[PDB]
Amino acid sequence: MFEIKKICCIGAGYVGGPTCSVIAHMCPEIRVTVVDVNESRINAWNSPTLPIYEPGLKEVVESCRGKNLFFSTNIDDAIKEADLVFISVNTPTKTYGMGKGRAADLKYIEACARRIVQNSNGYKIVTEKSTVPVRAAESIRRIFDANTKPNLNLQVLSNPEFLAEGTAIKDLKNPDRVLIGGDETPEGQRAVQALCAVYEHWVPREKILTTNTWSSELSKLAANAFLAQRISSINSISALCEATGADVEEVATAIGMDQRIGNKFLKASVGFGGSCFQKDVLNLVYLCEALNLPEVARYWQQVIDMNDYQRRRFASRIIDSLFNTVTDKKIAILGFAFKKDTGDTRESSSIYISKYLMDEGAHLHIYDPKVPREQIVVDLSHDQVSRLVTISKDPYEACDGAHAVVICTEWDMFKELDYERIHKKMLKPAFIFDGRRVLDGLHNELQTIGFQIETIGKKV
Amino acid sequence: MFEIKKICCIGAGYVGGPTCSVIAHMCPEIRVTVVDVNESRINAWNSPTLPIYEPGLKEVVESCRGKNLFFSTNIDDAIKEADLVFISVNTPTKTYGMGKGRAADLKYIEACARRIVQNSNGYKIVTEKSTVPVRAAESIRRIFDANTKPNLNLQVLSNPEFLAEGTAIKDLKNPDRVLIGGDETPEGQRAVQALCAVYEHWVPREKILTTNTWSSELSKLAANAFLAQRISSINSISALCEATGADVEEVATAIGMDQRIGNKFLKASVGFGGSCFQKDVLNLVYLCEALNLPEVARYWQQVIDMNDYQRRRFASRIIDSLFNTVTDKKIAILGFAFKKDTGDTRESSSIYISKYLMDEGAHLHIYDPKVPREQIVVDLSHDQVSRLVTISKDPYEACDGAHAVVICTEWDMFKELDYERIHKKMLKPAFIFDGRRVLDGLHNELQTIGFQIETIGKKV
Amino acid sequence: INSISALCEATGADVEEVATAIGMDQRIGNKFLKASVGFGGSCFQKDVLNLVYLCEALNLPEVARYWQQVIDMNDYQRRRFASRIIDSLFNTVTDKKIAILGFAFKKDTGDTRESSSIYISKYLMDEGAHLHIYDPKVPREQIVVDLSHDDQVSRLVTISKDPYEACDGAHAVVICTEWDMFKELDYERIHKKMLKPAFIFDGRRVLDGLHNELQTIGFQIETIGKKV
């Protein structure tokens, strides 16, 4: 049974970086080399300051860098040496052509496949770790076969990432499961077992699941779809709550106490964000359309439609409360990141709430304690931003003479604001629109102060 | 704080019967009286043989019947005596008028409300335990107010059932949670706490959740919707698996190992059945339409559409494999109950698979080890049944000269059949259509024997 | 016959065999039954569209939609072909070199009016392909004009002086015009310098009979009305 001594990962992103650092950390006898075409990242990884921030990562890297962990721009050589090649390049959504806005672009993956076969000889296991569309491994095999050589035996595996950015290290050292898909043939099985062996250094064999390569690719998309579906389901319920007098936090709790349902991913909000949920559901939907499965496509499209409905519904409540006119009205936007405790704004609901309000000609004053100023301007551009967008240094500068305060990100600090002070300098009637249920418990307080406070999933 | 000494439950169904028997069993100091207009049930409950079968129930009843547990047809007197009144009558789906086929008919609940107020005086807590549409408790309160008396104080609570028929006793003695909804006013809170006190006799206070009355009603519908959604989601995936070469059992496993998703209710099949899932989702959908929430209605309608698609897709695979002609072809239908280990056929997928095949003029031979013969004939009627339906005494009589064997219920015995014997007497080519993944592991065997075996979520 | 060609690809039938069997009926006759990527010319679409408008103006919508089908099928035929190419290249054509052999609407002319090559090229341009176009008769400036609205043509379109310069390092060869000279090319030479896997998409059935040759060479060859 083949043993893996040298590993090359293509891509120094948040996936390939931490995963290989951990592998190096739990497998001192293996030489792991992370490469990327970006000289900036590579030199940063070998620098005292790392190009990405993860809790516990800095310690892992400094423990291994120089012994068995190496970051280089020399991709060709790292490929030649390696027994295992992780393909960890991103697959952006197509911005044009067939599948525009939904289909995954395999351009970078195909580039890796051609680069690998070019610079490699003998036996090598090639593993796709980045999120790929289903049957992408067929595409890789097809490149390998057409570009074959004597004594060339490249085995293709699937081993998707399941780490949430922010807790990468914890997710890697103590994963719920490791997933490995390979062809159900003697050759494919030997390659799967070799990859297992690497993980067996720190992952119990009970938590390692082996499947065929297509089940593995599809599992990654479906898992994210199921998670997203849970959120959109509780959100659809929140709309019912507002219409019936029920309360979504009460309903979520009652639902989640069913062992079969569980209590995770049931917190209603203005809408899910992030670079994964919408991207992977849209890719799942495109897959179904391509495979002549329109009933399944429209089933999963509902997850996205509900999320868009949730955001639009929220903006509409704000606009109607301000008498369907927001021209030149000051509106405080507290929180711009897609979730708390991060600077990431990718697919942030704040972007969509802000944009709806901008279409009304609102004067938005945006505050976020972590998100860089230049990022907010970028996320709101296509002139219009110049006229309507002010970026506040502090929350009180954003609520000074504002008609309404809109909370879009569940930052802990928003709970602790001096709402007595804020109310004194707001225009009356003064509104608070809680899009994250963060001011729950503070309702009676804010109302006696004088606020009109509205929130997701609670009847007005 | 008020104490409940006498309890009257209206309805000796599978809900009111076991729940009150258990209450009597864990609260010897409380006198519980179960009533129903059906003299048949009542005399059966007081008979050595009980009108329903639940594991451990017979022992519970015989322990309490005569001390604090009583079954009577004397509804008026049981109401007069009781401190707490459980309303446990069923709410059938409307078969005509506004909301036909979706809306719940509140006729029996309203009848109980008028009967209660008629035969009652003083303080009484009235609790709806049966599954009701949201704001049904408003309907009950509206009857009580209009029919008021001096010294009449009827408090209305919601306390939905969460017991799966078949494990009622286990679900009652060790519930995941007890749900109690009441009006958020001093009066309503006192009534909620009184009902809690009853459950505190055997249920830890951590597992008792109190909400307002609308959250409670909605939680019961949403919980069943979420469960059903899980099944339809894995089913939609099974269709993708058949089209890609992935395997749904492998995918379900990989998905379910995520702690946040969990591994319950992820077993793909020909479609979910039962008297709860479709009924409550349709009621949830009607609720949304009535409340001008068309985006939410169509979101949840997808759960049902997918389930119907799953069944139709299955039948179509069978029909196409038999060259789109099934006229006078013998087809074995193994399993008619909606799930294994029961005689219940309500909304059984076997009904729909059978009916699709009957529309092709098939000669169906149906076998189920538990389902009564007369029930199958009833479930397939509106002449047509006489011509096309034969009910087999044993599985081999159903597979004698049949073109295909269709498994619709996951009975354990189907795994153990003499498939060598069956194949010898089948017409060639001989098909097995596994609608429950029960013959998983037996694939290579059945194929070497000579079967063409197809199943849910596996590429052919 | 083009609609039939789509059915042939899905059944294992062959459109040229079907066309012959049909055309041997005296009542149907054998002219105008050669399946292709789509008809072109300055007459067919123009006159059918005029016929349809006439029907609409005269309150004859059933007749209008009957004839509209001729145009819809022709548009479907072109789209279907372009999509086969795109899907075969893994649904990504960004910066992929693709040779387009033939630009005129039919062989033995410089006329490009309503040529199917224009529409196939544009579909591939919307994918970001690097098209290298060759036609022995069509003037260079005409091709540039027919692909404009600009900068997109500047970035994505190169016009080759000879076919081999267009197939040098290309992922796929797309034949859109039935020039006789395309049948006589040195496909052994072309394959050596193409990126692998190397595709040929025959949109005019000109390479019929040469399939086994091209397959033993190493080509993956696909065409109108023949199952893959």
- What is the maximum span of chain A, computed from C-alpha positions, in angstroms? 81
* Neighbouring subunits of B (3+ Cβ pairs under 8 A): A
Handedness of CA A286, A288, A290, A294 (dihedral sign): negative
Count the neighbouring beta carbons within 10 Å of the beta carbon of residue A28.
13
Show the tokens assigned to C219.
Answer: 């080509």
Q: Which of B395, B348, B342 is nearest to B367 (CA)?
A: B395
Bridge partners of residue A33, in order along the sequence: A8, A70
**Strand-strand pairing, B404-407 and B330-334:** parallel
Q: How far apart are CA B126 and CA B10, in angstroms?
A: 11
Q: How far apart are CA A190 and CA B115, in angstroms?
A: 73
In Å, how far is B344's CA from the nearest CA of chain A?
22
Supply the residues of C annotated as catalytic. 43
Q: Which of B292, B174, B308 is nearest to B235 (CA)?
A: B308
Q: Hey, is the C-beta of A236 within 8 angstroms of any chain B C-beta?
A: yes
Q: Please check whether residue A45 is in contact with residue A71, taking contact to mean a CB–CB distance below 8 angstroms.
A: yes
* Phi-psi region at B447: left, alpha or beta (left = phi > 0; alpha = psi -120 to 50): alpha
Q: How far apart are CA B70 and CA B34, in angstroms?
A: 6
Q: Which residues of C touch A98 (CB under 8 A)?
A: 83, 86-87, 91, 127
Question: Which of C94, C195, C196 has its CB closest to that of A107?
Answer: C94
Reply yes or no on whether B408 is catalytic: no
Residue B410 — φ and ψ, nearest 5°? -80, 40
CA atoms within 13 A on the CB side of A84: 31
To the question of whether residue B343 is assigned a binding role by annotation, the answer is no
Residue A99 — φ and ψ, nearest 5°? 90, 15
What is each CA distance from A62 to A17, A57, A314, B212, C20, in whole angstroms?
Answer: 13, 9, 46, 54, 74
| DSSP SS3 for A158 | strand
Residue owning tokens 């070998």: A46
Q: How far apart are CA C94 and CA A98, in angstroms?
A: 12
> What are the strands of the beta sheet with A389-391, ordered from one edge?
A389-391, A363-367, A330-334, A404-407, A431-434, A452-455
Residue B398 — φ and ψ, nearest 5°? -85, -25
Show the tokens assigned to B216.
Answer: 């409670």
Helix (H) or strand (E) holding A33: strand A31-35
Q: How far apart are CA B392 and CA B413, in angstroms?
A: 15
DSSP code for B261: T
Helix (H) or strand (E) holding B446: helix B443-449
Q: Please check whether residue A184 is in contact with residue A212, taking contact to mean a CB–CB distance below 8 angstroms.
A: yes
Handedness of CA B42, B48, B52, B57 (dihedral sign): positive
Q: Which of C41, C207, C184, C202 is nearest to C109 (CA)?
A: C41
Q: Please check whether residue A318 is in contact with residue A390, taking contact to mean a CB–CB distance below 8 angstroms.
A: no
| DSSP SS3 for A342 | coil
Please give the resolution of this entry in Å, rounded to 1 decimal.
Answer: 2.7
Helix (H) or strand (E) holding C47: helix C44-57
| Radius of gyration for chain A, computed over Cα atoms and rounded to the nearest angstrom | 25
* Phi-psi region at C59: left, alpha or beta (left = phi > 0; alpha = psi -120 to 50): left
Task: State how far Cα A385 lies from the chain centre.
Answer: 26
Count the neighbouring beta carbons within 10 Å of the beta carbon of residue C110.
12
Q: Which residues of A touch C90 (CB under 8 A)?
A: 106, 110, 139
CA atoms within 13 A on the CB side of A390: 18
Q: How far apart are CA A15 and CA A340, in angstroms?
A: 21
Q: How far apart are CA B49 and CA B15, in angstroms?
A: 18
- What is the maximum span of chain B, computed from C-alpha positions, in angstroms? 81
Note whether C90 contacts A98, CB cutoff 8 Å.
no
Show the tokens assigned to B105.
Answer: 């008919």
For every residue of B57-93, DSSP letters joined together read: HHHHHHHHBTTTEEEES-HHHHHHH-SEEEE----PB
Task: Give the residue from chain B lying closest to A223, CA to CA.
Answer: B255
Q: How far apart are CA A87 and CA A260, in angstroms?
A: 36
Show the tokens assigned to B244.
Answer: 């890609």
Q: Which of C110, C127, C116 is nearest to C201 (CA)?
A: C116
Show the tokens assigned to A353.
Answer: 């709430």
After which residues does chain B show a gap where C to N exceeds 2.5 Å?
382
By CB atoms closer than 10 A (0-12, 13-18, 19+), residue B81 is: middle
Residues sharing a CB contact under 8 Å with residue B14, sequence separation 6 or more, in sequence order: B52, B54, B163, B165, B168
Helix (H) or strand (E) holding C78: helix C61-88
For every residue of A349-396, DSSP letters joined together read: HHHHHHHHHHTTT-EEEEE-SSS-HHHHHHHH---HHHHHEEE-SSHH
Show the tokens assigned to A253.
Answer: 């709790």
Angle between helices A213-244 and A277-290 (to 10 degrees): 110
Residues sharing a CB contact under 8 Å with residue B50, sequence separation 6 or more, in sequence order: B44, B57, B58, B61
Residue A56 is which amino acid? G
- Length of chain B, in residues: 460
Count the neighbouring beta carbons within 10 Å of the beta carbon of residue C40.
25
Reply yes or no on whether A276 is catalytic: yes
Count the neighbouring beta carbons within 10 Å of the beta carbon of residue C187.
22
Q: Please check whether residue B414 is in contact with residue B335, taking contact to mean a CB–CB distance below 8 angstroms.
A: yes
- The CATH code that applies to domain B1-212 is 3.40.50.720
Fold of C12-228: Rossmann fold (3.40.50)
Helix (H) or strand (E) holding C159: strand C157-159
| DSSP SS3 for B117 | helix
Q: How far apart are CA A221 and CA A300, in angstroms?
A: 11
> What are the strands of the beta sheet with A69-72, ordered from one edge?
A69-72, A31-35, A6-10, A84-87, A122-128, A152-158, A178-182, A208-212
Reply yes or no on whether A220 is catalytic: yes
**Distance from first CA to last CA of chain C, Å, rounded?**
19
Q: Hey, is the C-beta of A237 within 8 angstroms of any chain B C-beta?
A: yes
B245-460: which CATH architecture? 3-Layer(aba) Sandwich (3.40)
Residues sharing a CB contact under 8 Å with residue A447, sequence separation 6 or more, in sequence order: A453
* Class of CATH domain A213-244: mainly alpha
Residue B358 is which amino acid? M
What is each CA distance from A190 to A157, A179, A453, B251, in whole angstroms?
Answer: 11, 16, 61, 21
What is each CA distance from A195 to A7, A212, A327, B354, in whole angstroms?
Answer: 11, 14, 60, 47
C-alpha torsion angle, residues A215, A221, A222, A226 (rounded to 10): 160
By CB atoms closer than 10 A (0-12, 13-18, 19+), residue B233 is: buried
Residue B173 is which amino acid? K
Q: How far apart are CA A17 and CA A19, in angstroms?
A: 6
Give the 3-state DSSP-derived string for A246-302, with helices as H, strands as E and coil as C: CEHHHHHHHHHCCCCCCCCCCCCCCCCCCCCHHHHHHHHHHHHHHCCCHHHHHHHHH
Q: How far apart are CA B232 and CA B120, in angstroms?
A: 46
Count the neighbouring beta carbons within 10 Å of the beta carbon of residue B460.
10
Residue B181 — φ and ψ, nearest 5°? -115, 140
Count the neighbouring beta carbons within 10 Å of the beta carbon of residue A438.
21
Note whether A146 contacts C126, CB cutoff 8 Å.
no
What is each CA distance from B26 to B63, B164, B192, B196, B202, in whole angstroms?
Answer: 11, 20, 19, 14, 6
Domains A1-212 and A245-460 share a fold: yes
Q: Please check whether residue B449 is in contact with residue B420, taking contact to mean a CB–CB distance below 8 angstroms.
A: yes
Q: How far apart are CA C145 and CA C153, in angstroms?
A: 9
Residues sharing a CB contact under 8 Å with residue A383, sequence separation 6 or more, in sequence order: none
In Å, how far is C90's CA from the nearest CA of chain A?
7
Q: Please check whether residue A61 is in contact with residue A18, taking contact to mean a CB–CB distance below 8 angstroms.
A: no
Residues sharing a CB contact under 8 Å with residue A207, sequence separation 6 or more, in sequence order: A175, A176, A177, A178, B257
Question: Which of B233, B250, B257 has its CB closest to that of A215?
Answer: B250
Q: Hey, is the C-beta of C92 within 8 angstroms of any chain A C-beta?
A: yes
Q: Which of B108, B114, B116 is nearest to B82 (CA)?
A: B116
Count the neighbouring beta carbons within 10 Å of the beta carbon of residue B97.
8
Q: Please check whether residue C221 is in contact with residue C202, taking contact to mean a CB–CB distance below 8 angstroms.
A: yes
Count the neighbouring beta carbons within 10 Å of the beta carbon of residue B350.
29
Note whether A254 contacts B229, CB cutoff 8 Å.
no
| DSSP SS3 for B389 | strand
Show the tokens assigned to C113.
Answer: 């009016």
Task: State how far Cα B231 lies from the chain centre.
Answer: 14
Q: How far apart are CA B245 and CA B250, in angstroms?
A: 11
Show the tokens assigned to B287.
Answer: 């609720």
Task: State how far Cα A180 lies from the chain centre.
Answer: 21
Q: Hey, is the C-beta of A203 within 8 angstroms of any chain B C-beta?
A: no
| Domain segments of chain B as ranges | 1-212, 213-244, 245-460
Q: How far apart are CA A216 and CA A223, in angstroms?
A: 11
What is each CA distance from C224 to A275, C86, C94, in whole angstroms?
Answer: 40, 15, 24
Residue B94 is which amino acid? K
Preceding omega of C197 cis (within 30 degrees of 0): yes
Residues sharing a CB contact under 8 Å with residue A382, sequence separation 6 or more, in sequence order: none
Task: Give the residue from chain A lying closest to C129, CA to CA.
Answer: A97
Count the neighbouring beta carbons within 10 Å of the beta carbon of residue C8.
22
Q: Please check whether residue A313 is in contact with residue A235, taking contact to mean a CB–CB distance below 8 angstroms.
A: no
Q: Please check whether residue A7 is in contact with residue A155, taking contact to mean a CB–CB distance below 8 angstroms.
A: no
Note whether C86 contacts A97, CB cutoff 8 Å.
yes
Residues sharing a CB contact under 8 Å with residue B383, sequence separation 6 or more, in sequence order: none
Give the 3-state DSSP-derived string for C56-74, with helices as H, strands as E and coil as C: HHCCCHHHHHHHHHHHHHH
Q: How far apart are CA A451 and CA A432, in angstroms?
A: 7
To the question of whether residue B222 is assigned a binding role by annotation, the answer is yes
Count the neighbouring beta carbons within 10 Å of the beta carbon of residue B307.
26
Give the 3-state DSSP-derived string for A127-149, with helices as H, strands as E and coil as C: EECCCCCCCHHHHHHHHHHHCCC
Show the tokens assigned to B426.
Answer: 């089948």
Q: Hey, is the C-beta of A360 within 8 angstroms of any chain C C-beta?
A: no
> What are the strands of the beta sheet with B431-434, ordered from one edge?
B389-391, B363-367, B330-334, B404-407, B431-434, B452-455
Q: Which of B63, B60, B62 is nearest to B48 (CA)?
A: B62
Note whether A293 contacts B243, CB cutoff 8 Å.
yes
